[PDB]
């Protein structure tokens, strides 16, 4: 993941799928590498069940 | 603030300064927007006096 340092000195973690900061969009964490992606960027449409583990293209 | 919904269905509120969930580190709440930050993410080293109000870069 790219991290942006903005004008306020805050750190923004960027989706590796689109690599764009203007998110809002909900994100999902990879349960192997812990990169975080926007749901639409990895084809997720609804909140997935809590019991489940999601894994990101690389892993 | 980002909110993580973890394995257990619990909600973790994230410091917008670092956007790292793994704290330990104490937090301080903005008396305007009520975003919370880690002390070191906003340059706070000691507990402020209680009569005092703190405000966060944005407010």
């Amino acid at each position: 993941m790219y991290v942006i340092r903005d004008e306020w000195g805050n750190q923004i973690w960027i989706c590796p799928g689109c690599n764009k900061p203007d998110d809002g969009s909900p994100m999902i964490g990879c349960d192997d590498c812990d990169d975080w992606y926007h749901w639409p960027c990895v084809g997720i449409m609804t909140a997935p069940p809590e019991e489940m583990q999601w894994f990101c293209p690389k892993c | 603030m980002y909110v993580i919904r973890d394995e257990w269905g619990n909600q973790i509120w994230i410091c917008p300064g670092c956007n790292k969930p793994d704290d330990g580190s104490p937090m301080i709440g903005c008396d305007d927007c009520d975003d919370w930050y880690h002390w070191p993410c906003v340059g706070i080293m000691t507990a402020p006096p209680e009569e005092m109000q703190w405000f966060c870069p944005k407010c």
Binding site: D31, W39, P48, M52 | -
Partner: peptide
């Protein structure tokens, strides 16, 4: 899994 949003 773990999700997050504003």
């Amino acid at each position: 899994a773990r999700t997050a949003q504003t």
